[PDB]
RNA sequence: ACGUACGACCAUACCCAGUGGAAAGCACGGCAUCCCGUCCGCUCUGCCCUAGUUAAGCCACUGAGGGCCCGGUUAGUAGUUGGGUCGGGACCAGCGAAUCCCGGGUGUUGUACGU
RNA sequence: GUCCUAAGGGGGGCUCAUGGAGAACAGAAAUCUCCAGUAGAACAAAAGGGUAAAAGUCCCCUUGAUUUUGAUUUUUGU
RNA sequence: AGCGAAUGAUUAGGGACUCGGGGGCGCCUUCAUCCAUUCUCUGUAAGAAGCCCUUGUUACU
């Protein structure tokens, strides 16, 4: 229970901008993600066509990026400043992951370039404990123990203890 | 062979349409000098107890 | 339906040509060995 | 046979010319598969190739038998236990006859079918017989 | 026009006959002018060959084959086929652009005819074509036969 | 509200093989590795199995039978402490030394050790052992095939370091130079100097030099036992060369592991002392009766 | 006997929950210069075996667990092969099951190196 | 008259259909994350057989989709 | 070999409707168009031509 190998850690933070249309808007959204993260973002195509969404199959409609390490903690804490360290209880998943979404990227500290415009973001934080390599490695891949899996209540407690957040 | 269309209505008609058809057809047989066209393809099937009560009351 | 007769030595006609050629060379060698 | 992976001791069995093999067709491997007939048939190996063997089968047509030579991969052939009862027996007769000739006493060395049993005595003590009716009395209850 | 036909005719709520008619019309328009279509829309329409309707399947395969002979670069590496990938790898297939006209500086098969003439001269010794010698009709027939043989060898 | 894992699912479930459920064996590659031509009959097919752990390298010569595999010879990385290498037992040079040791051991076991002596001074060149000029005639080199297991065979992996060590020991392993840690994919030319540097462990040496120049704290954190045993960056080449010389001199040295030492019988006794046992059926019936009494009380 | 590597049968081995692990070995682990690969050193690859911890993997035990496997019975029954100048199914001569129920069990083992 | 009668080989990586829980606009459906998932996907038989570090999908090279000679099966030549 | 929620119906109530058609005086309409809705899962073996030992031949391994 109090083992040093049971500490909750941020496995990754995934940043998503789903524009819903291809072209210059998606290019500028990818520029926003590249400027925020420091890495090359990856584009996401539509896997099937919807008529009244205005999208078609094999059309790039979204962009996303994954950050790990202290950079993920920094960007997540900036987003938590934007959300004023207040998340509703439904934002925490049953497996112990969480996430939220901002409506504009200027509040993270990015300057407003008139060429780029206004884009919002989806932040998703995936949490692990040390020992996830058991399920992610190639040779002798196994399953994480039930006592080692993260609980939604443990994630909520970790959030309220580290970030001084108000889960309500 | 089993088929789903054996258990469906094969001919349906609305109340006002049936009433208008019956009225027009009756007006047509009113005149004996008028003959129909393609009568075999027309829905002509739509056009074409005191003792019991007393015995029921008193056997 | 009687069982058909079977030859004492089956032909090398069915076997693979590499082993057939090696077997023919071996038969020539044992023939010269017997002749000696 | 269970779906999925094939056991790998199939490839480690060594077949030679003259060996007796069954044909049990594996559904998973389609290469080297024989006909619909010649499945479940026992034959003689005449040719041994890298991944397949040649099997001599005697098919029947009309009122005669025709020799057929069938090329079957090692997936579908299995060693046949028809002549193990011959090889073990002939070895056993070889050493037993050598030992009996060395010792001097002749023996019966041919296998014999089931003879009638000899006379013996059965004791009644602690095994007293019970009397049975044509129907059980607890059943008639 | 192609975008409107694709939006109104081939979609999730569209009927199979409507989708087949739209894809056939799109195939005919692409036959007349291939540059009207974008590569993403082309790959989307070619992926309709996995549809369970036979008419839509054949229409999508017709569009795919049409772009296979015409312009295979938009088509996916899975859907290009043998000859298209071989031509694109060896470098014979060139991009088709608006306004390009055939600009053969020499006759087709003239190099093959010159090679055949050189082979005949070498055989005679053992026993430039358009620049000096006038085109004999038998020589033109031999050049056409050599061009057909070269096309058959390239197909093989 | 549906249940995927129900009784019908558990009844229709067909498991994989045990060593595939454990994630240790690739049977698709194993079939090709162990399948021998039936024209060749009972000719053994030797495979050099290489495996890597956190603190050891496991190299074996393996043949296949019906009821199990046979280890003809085996060499481990921790046995290089007898030959001098007591630091960095999982690096590329230790992999090379373990492959060399396994090759020398299998050649000594076969008896062809003096007939087939490979490259005595490693140079870093793509070479394969050929037929030796025996007095009787031409003797072909002993042939083995590499088995990497579930390892990713990229450029610079130690699965090829073990293979290079065995090939320089004298075993004929069919191989190509494109997966050695000096090969450039664009140039398609192997860098002999870089390959020799990896053989003699110069990459670790320049790693220590770079950290000694740049980050002293991380250098002391990582290479602490190197400092404690006072082995330097420039001495690695001589250390590995002397280790190669001792391996070629006496390939059957015995190494004391410094672990607690006992015999098989009292190790068995200790393991049964530290072993809880299954309940007897009388005890399990007593506990089932206790559970039935608890259910009756409830 | 217990680990590791390669394995043979391929659930008595799988799935879900708990409890414990001497010794060493595995394992999580620590660092991204080199070889290498990624949107991300997550995986893969390279280097360290120092530190921490058995928390997870792994092993063992527990469960009136689901599943799976093996025995009795079911049953000399059902079924089936011949016979009668047997009746309007029963005998004679023989072969001969599987469910349902009642229970048991929850892996054996080869080679090599070690604890 | 147009259109369709199907891209094969080698190596490597990864699992599919679907369900549950979550993320600004975003909802039943657009993209992202985790868990469960014996094939319930896909492979040109719509409820046949066979496939999960693959026979599926993606990436990198390639056309063994090449000549020549016999044997076998379906049964004189095919 | 054929069938198949890849099916068969429902559309009263809501809309879009407009030239879809038609009527009356560019304007309204009367039908009708559809859409939104919903319902329906028998082979082989039982030997002297067979077994065991020794020994050669080979371009195969």
PDB file of N, CA, C and O in Angstrom, chain D residues 38-78:
ATOM      1  N   UNK D  38      -8.141 -41.447 -50.199  1.00  0.00           N
ATOM      2  CA  UNK D  38      -6.793 -41.707 -49.657  1.00  0.00           C
ATOM      3  C   UNK D  38      -6.602 -41.012 -48.314  1.00  0.00           C
ATOM      4  O   UNK D  38      -5.457 -40.874 -47.866  1.00  0.00           O
ATOM      5  N   UNK D  39      -7.672 -40.564 -47.665  1.00  0.00           N
ATOM      6  CA  UNK D  39      -7.613 -40.040 -46.307  1.00  0.00           C
ATOM      7  C   UNK D  39      -8.051 -41.139 -45.351  1.00  0.00           C
ATOM      8  O   UNK D  39      -9.087 -41.777 -45.565  1.00  0.00           O
ATOM      9  N   UNK D  40      -7.265 -41.359 -44.304  1.00  0.00           N
ATOM     10  CA  UNK D  40      -7.491 -42.487 -43.426  1.00  0.00           C
ATOM     11  C   UNK D  40      -7.030 -43.813 -43.979  1.00  0.00           C
ATOM     12  O   UNK D  40      -7.520 -44.856 -43.533  1.00  0.00           O
ATOM     13  N   UNK D  41      -6.107 -43.808 -44.936  1.00  0.00           N
ATOM     14  CA  UNK D  41      -5.605 -45.021 -45.564  1.00  0.00           C
ATOM     15  C   UNK D  41      -4.162 -45.250 -45.140  1.00  0.00           C
ATOM     16  O   UNK D  41      -3.434 -44.294 -44.849  1.00  0.00           O
ATOM     17  N   UNK D  42      -3.763 -46.514 -45.102  1.00  0.00           N
ATOM     18  CA  UNK D  42      -2.437 -46.928 -44.676  1.00  0.00           C
ATOM     19  C   UNK D  42      -1.631 -47.418 -45.876  1.00  0.00           C
ATOM     20  O   UNK D  42      -2.124 -48.175 -46.716  1.00  0.00           O
ATOM     21  N   UNK D  43      -0.380 -46.975 -45.955  1.00  0.00           N
ATOM     22  CA  UNK D  43       0.426 -47.306 -47.115  1.00  0.00           C
ATOM     23  C   UNK D  43       1.895 -47.417 -46.773  1.00  0.00           C
ATOM     24  O   UNK D  43       2.303 -47.300 -45.613  1.00  0.00           O
ATOM     25  N   UNK D  44       2.689 -47.634 -47.820  1.00  0.00           N
ATOM     26  CA  UNK D  44       4.118 -47.912 -47.712  1.00  0.00           C
ATOM     27  C   UNK D  44       4.883 -46.743 -48.314  1.00  0.00           C
ATOM     28  O   UNK D  44       4.531 -46.253 -49.394  1.00  0.00           O
ATOM     29  N   UNK D  45       5.930 -46.296 -47.618  1.00  0.00           N
ATOM     30  CA  UNK D  45       6.764 -45.221 -48.141  1.00  0.00           C
ATOM     31  C   UNK D  45       7.708 -45.775 -49.198  1.00  0.00           C
ATOM     32  O   UNK D  45       8.441 -46.741 -48.955  1.00  0.00           O
ATOM     33  N   UNK D  46       7.694 -45.162 -50.383  1.00  0.00           N
ATOM     34  CA  UNK D  46       8.642 -45.500 -51.433  1.00  0.00           C
ATOM     35  C   UNK D  46       9.606 -44.374 -51.775  1.00  0.00           C
ATOM     36  O   UNK D  46      10.716 -44.660 -52.239  1.00  0.00           O
ATOM     37  N   UNK D  47       9.225 -43.118 -51.567  1.00  0.00           N
ATOM     38  CA  UNK D  47      10.084 -41.986 -51.879  1.00  0.00           C
ATOM     39  C   UNK D  47      10.033 -41.001 -50.723  1.00  0.00           C
ATOM     40  O   UNK D  47       8.956 -40.709 -50.198  1.00  0.00           O
ATOM     41  N   UNK D  48      11.199 -40.496 -50.333  1.00  0.00           N
ATOM     42  CA  UNK D  48      11.327 -39.529 -49.250  1.00  0.00           C
ATOM     43  C   UNK D  48      11.925 -38.260 -49.838  1.00  0.00           C
ATOM     44  O   UNK D  48      13.032 -38.285 -50.391  1.00  0.00           O
ATOM     45  N   UNK D  49      11.197 -37.154 -49.724  1.00  0.00           N
ATOM     46  CA  UNK D  49      11.620 -35.874 -50.263  1.00  0.00           C
ATOM     47  C   UNK D  49      11.690 -34.893 -49.078  1.00  0.00           C
ATOM     48  O   UNK D  49      11.361 -35.255 -47.948  1.00  0.00           O
ATOM     49  N   UNK D  50      12.138 -33.656 -49.336  1.00  0.00           N
ATOM     50  CA  UNK D  50      12.469 -32.676 -48.301  1.00  0.00           C
ATOM     51  C   UNK D  50      11.311 -32.396 -47.347  1.00  0.00           C
ATOM     52  O   UNK D  50      11.490 -32.375 -46.124  1.00  0.00           O
ATOM     53  N   UNK D  51      10.115 -32.174 -47.886  1.00  0.00           N
ATOM     54  CA  UNK D  51       8.955 -31.870 -47.057  1.00  0.00           C
ATOM     55  C   UNK D  51       7.788 -32.809 -47.314  1.00  0.00           C
ATOM     56  O   UNK D  51       6.710 -32.610 -46.743  1.00  0.00           O
ATOM     57  N   UNK D  52       7.970 -33.830 -48.149  1.00  0.00           N
ATOM     58  CA  UNK D  52       6.894 -34.744 -48.493  1.00  0.00           C
ATOM     59  C   UNK D  52       7.453 -36.147 -48.663  1.00  0.00           C
ATOM     60  O   UNK D  52       8.660 -36.351 -48.808  1.00  0.00           O
ATOM     61  N   UNK D  53       6.547 -37.122 -48.635  1.00  0.00           N
ATOM     62  CA  UNK D  53       6.879 -38.525 -48.829  1.00  0.00           C
ATOM     63  C   UNK D  53       5.894 -39.120 -49.824  1.00  0.00           C
ATOM     64  O   UNK D  53       4.770 -38.633 -49.986  1.00  0.00           O
ATOM     65  N   UNK D  54       6.319 -40.189 -50.490  1.00  0.00           N
ATOM     66  CA  UNK D  54       5.481 -40.906 -51.432  1.00  0.00           C
ATOM     67  C   UNK D  54       4.933 -42.173 -50.796  1.00  0.00           C
ATOM     68  O   UNK D  54       5.686 -42.973 -50.240  1.00  0.00           O
ATOM     69  N   UNK D  55       3.618 -42.340 -50.894  1.00  0.00           N
ATOM     70  CA  UNK D  55       2.897 -43.418 -50.229  1.00  0.00           C
ATOM     71  C   UNK D  55       2.258 -44.307 -51.288  1.00  0.00           C
ATOM     72  O   UNK D  55       1.641 -43.813 -52.238  1.00  0.00           O
ATOM     73  N   UNK D  56       2.423 -45.618 -51.129  1.00  0.00           N
ATOM     74  CA  UNK D  56       1.848 -46.611 -52.028  1.00  0.00           C
ATOM     75  C   UNK D  56       0.506 -47.041 -51.450  1.00  0.00           C
ATOM     76  O   UNK D  56       0.448 -47.652 -50.378  1.00  0.00           O
ATOM     77  N   UNK D  57      -0.574 -46.736 -52.161  1.00  0.00           N
ATOM     78  CA  UNK D  57      -1.918 -47.123 -51.758  1.00  0.00           C
ATOM     79  C   UNK D  57      -2.448 -48.075 -52.826  1.00  0.00           C
ATOM     80  O   UNK D  57      -2.017 -48.047 -53.979  1.00  0.00           O
ATOM     81  N   UNK D  58      -3.350 -48.965 -52.431  1.00  0.00           N
ATOM     82  CA  UNK D  58      -3.985 -49.886 -53.375  1.00  0.00           C
ATOM     83  C   UNK D  58      -5.463 -49.524 -53.475  1.00  0.00           C
ATOM     84  O   UNK D  58      -6.276 -49.959 -52.653  1.00  0.00           O
ATOM     85  N   UNK D  59      -5.807 -48.724 -54.482  1.00  0.00           N
ATOM     86  CA  UNK D  59      -7.193 -48.339 -54.706  1.00  0.00           C
ATOM     87  C   UNK D  59      -7.944 -49.491 -55.364  1.00  0.00           C
ATOM     88  O   UNK D  59      -7.348 -50.344 -56.025  1.00  0.00           O
ATOM     89  N   UNK D  60      -9.257 -49.530 -55.167  1.00  0.00           N
ATOM     90  CA  UNK D  60     -10.101 -50.519 -55.821  1.00  0.00           C
ATOM     91  C   UNK D  60     -10.951 -49.844 -56.893  1.00  0.00           C
ATOM     92  O   UNK D  60     -11.508 -48.763 -56.672  1.00  0.00           O
ATOM     93  N   UNK D  61     -10.970 -50.446 -58.079  1.00  0.00           N
ATOM     94  CA  UNK D  61     -11.835 -50.042 -59.181  1.00  0.00           C
ATOM     95  C   UNK D  61     -12.406 -51.311 -59.797  1.00  0.00           C
ATOM     96  O   UNK D  61     -11.647 -52.219 -60.156  1.00  0.00           O
ATOM     97  N   UNK D  62     -13.739 -51.365 -59.910  1.00  0.00           N
ATOM     98  CA  UNK D  62     -14.479 -52.500 -60.457  1.00  0.00           C
ATOM     99  C   UNK D  62     -14.151 -53.793 -59.719  1.00  0.00           C
ATOM    100  O   UNK D  62     -14.500 -53.949 -58.544  1.00  0.00           O
ATOM    101  N   UNK D  63     -13.480 -54.723 -60.394  1.00  0.00           N
ATOM    102  CA  UNK D  63     -13.134 -56.022 -59.828  1.00  0.00           C
ATOM    103  C   UNK D  63     -11.623 -56.237 -59.777  1.00  0.00           C
ATOM    104  O   UNK D  63     -11.135 -57.352 -59.964  1.00  0.00           O
ATOM    105  N   UNK D  64     -10.864 -55.174 -59.518  1.00  0.00           N
ATOM    106  CA  UNK D  64      -9.412 -55.276 -59.469  1.00  0.00           C
ATOM    107  C   UNK D  64      -8.856 -54.169 -58.585  1.00  0.00           C
ATOM    108  O   UNK D  64      -9.542 -53.197 -58.262  1.00  0.00           O
ATOM    109  N   UNK D  65      -7.593 -54.330 -58.198  1.00  0.00           N
ATOM    110  CA  UNK D  65      -6.877 -53.357 -57.385  1.00  0.00           C
ATOM    111  C   UNK D  65      -5.802 -52.696 -58.236  1.00  0.00           C
ATOM    112  O   UNK D  65      -5.110 -53.374 -59.003  1.00  0.00           O
ATOM    113  N   UNK D  66      -5.660 -51.382 -58.096  1.00  0.00           N
ATOM    114  CA  UNK D  66      -4.691 -50.598 -58.853  1.00  0.00           C
ATOM    115  C   UNK D  66      -3.772 -49.891 -57.866  1.00  0.00           C
ATOM    116  O   UNK D  66      -4.237 -49.245 -56.916  1.00  0.00           O
ATOM    117  N   UNK D  67      -2.466 -50.033 -58.083  1.00  0.00           N
ATOM    118  CA  UNK D  67      -1.481 -49.333 -57.273  1.00  0.00           C
ATOM    119  C   UNK D  67      -1.484 -47.846 -57.604  1.00  0.00           C
ATOM    120  O   UNK D  67      -1.492 -47.456 -58.775  1.00  0.00           O
ATOM    121  N   UNK D  68      -1.480 -47.018 -56.564  1.00  0.00           N
ATOM    122  CA  UNK D  68      -1.467 -45.571 -56.679  1.00  0.00           C
ATOM    123  C   UNK D  68      -0.304 -45.040 -55.855  1.00  0.00           C
ATOM    124  O   UNK D  68      -0.044 -45.528 -54.751  1.00  0.00           O
ATOM    125  N   UNK D  69       0.396 -44.049 -56.392  1.00  0.00           N
ATOM    126  CA  UNK D  69       1.522 -43.421 -55.712  1.00  0.00           C
ATOM    127  C   UNK D  69       1.121 -41.987 -55.397  1.00  0.00           C
ATOM    128  O   UNK D  69       0.898 -41.187 -56.311  1.00  0.00           O
ATOM    129  N   UNK D  70       1.036 -41.657 -54.112  1.00  0.00           N
ATOM    130  CA  UNK D  70       0.471 -40.389 -53.668  1.00  0.00           C
ATOM    131  C   UNK D  70       1.548 -39.600 -52.938  1.00  0.00           C
ATOM    132  O   UNK D  70       2.183 -40.110 -52.009  1.00  0.00           O
ATOM    133  N   UNK D  71       1.756 -38.355 -53.361  1.00  0.00           N
ATOM    134  CA  UNK D  71       2.748 -37.476 -52.754  1.00  0.00           C
ATOM    135  C   UNK D  71       2.077 -36.653 -51.662  1.00  0.00           C
ATOM    136  O   UNK D  71       1.234 -35.799 -51.955  1.00  0.00           O
ATOM    137  N   UNK D  72       2.452 -36.908 -50.408  1.00  0.00           N
ATOM    138  CA  UNK D  72       1.809 -36.292 -49.256  1.00  0.00           C
ATOM    139  C   UNK D  72       2.873 -35.641 -48.387  1.00  0.00           C
ATOM    140  O   UNK D  72       3.887 -36.261 -48.054  1.00  0.00           O
ATOM    141  N   UNK D  73       2.634 -34.387 -48.005  1.00  0.00           N
ATOM    142  CA  UNK D  73       3.530 -33.679 -47.102  1.00  0.00           C
ATOM    143  C   UNK D  73       3.550 -34.335 -45.726  1.00  0.00           C
ATOM    144  O   UNK D  73       2.662 -35.114 -45.369  1.00  0.00           O
ATOM    145  N   UNK D  74       4.582 -34.003 -44.945  1.00  0.00           N
ATOM    146  CA  UNK D  74       4.755 -34.576 -43.618  1.00  0.00           C
ATOM    147  C   UNK D  74       3.671 -34.143 -42.643  1.00  0.00           C
ATOM    148  O   UNK D  74       3.497 -34.786 -41.605  1.00  0.00           O
ATOM    149  N   UNK D  75       2.941 -33.067 -42.952  1.00  0.00           N
ATOM    150  CA  UNK D  75       1.774 -32.643 -42.191  1.00  0.00           C
ATOM    151  C   UNK D  75       0.710 -33.722 -42.064  1.00  0.00           C
ATOM    152  O   UNK D  75       0.124 -33.866 -40.985  1.00  0.00           O
ATOM    153  N   UNK D  76       0.450 -34.480 -43.127  1.00  0.00           N
ATOM    154  CA  UNK D  76      -0.704 -35.361 -43.176  1.00  0.00           C
ATOM    155  C   UNK D  76      -0.363 -36.828 -42.968  1.00  0.00           C
ATOM    156  O   UNK D  76      -1.283 -37.646 -42.860  1.00  0.00           O
ATOM    157  N   UNK D  77       0.916 -37.189 -42.913  1.00  0.00           N
ATOM    158  CA  UNK D  77       1.317 -38.568 -42.663  1.00  0.00           C
ATOM    159  C   UNK D  77       1.598 -38.738 -41.178  1.00  0.00           C
ATOM    160  O   UNK D  77       2.057 -37.817 -40.491  1.00  0.00           O
ATOM    161  N   UNK D  78       1.284 -39.928 -40.680  1.00  0.00           N
ATOM    162  CA  UNK D  78       1.533 -40.336 -39.313  1.00  0.00           C
ATOM    163  C   UNK D  78       2.094 -41.750 -39.332  1.00  0.00           C
ATOM    164  O   UNK D  78       1.656 -42.572 -40.146  1.00  0.00           O
TER     165      UNK D  78
END
